[PDB]
Design a protein around this nucleic acid. Structure first.
Lengths: 97, 97
DNA sequence: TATTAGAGAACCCTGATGTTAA
DNA sequence: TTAACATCAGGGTTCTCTAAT
């Protein structure tokens, strides 16, 4: 028996989320943001990424609703309070010790 | 100030794994294979995939060592007994109910 | 059955241009 | 103007399907 289109739907969404997490630098980002608030520049020096590239990664994380922001003047502070991210990171830390 | 190259590597491996899982059809596949043994044809007909495409996806799953194979000479049976896969799927099913 | 090649799109960098607040 | 980010434009790389007269 073939799978019901709803299962396909679920798999599609889950895959979108996982894909948002399925990148090394993005993973480092989510780790760091889960543990603290950071300015984009500081993030750039923490994952060793350029401002443009990191801003794109952050945009893709925003696309999946994986990060939150607060504004102070010209500086934006990113953080992560996504249950999903913490669950996945938890599983990952259970796997690789 | 920046993350240690060791952390970069950890992130690389974890991201490689997640990338292996970050696909809808592949997710359905890993679900089905985690819960039972199946022949390639049956898999192809339950996830709504062609033989070639499914064979390619399974090739990628094998590349990350997320599945095992058994031969009945003309028929090959795929299965999954990776704790990591079950952890990620567990988290996913914890999220989306 | 697994392997190939190819089209079309998504990815992910660099570098330049936009947006927003002091 | 400067400062901190966002987004655009391009080009190389990677994905995932179909075709295999």
């Amino acid at each position: 028996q073939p799978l019901s289109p709803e299962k396909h739907e679920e798999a599609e969404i889950a895959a979108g989320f996982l894909s948002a997490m399925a990148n090394p630098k993005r993973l480092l980002i989510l780790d760091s943001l889960v543990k603290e608030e950071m300015a984009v520049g500081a993030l750039a020096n923490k994952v060793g990424l350029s401002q443009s590239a990191l801003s794109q990664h952050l945009s893709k994380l925003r696309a999946q609703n994986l990060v939150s922001t607060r504004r102070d003047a010209q500086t934006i502070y990113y953080s992560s309070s996504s249950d999903s991210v913490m669950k996945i990171l938890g599983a990952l830390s259970e796997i690789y010790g």
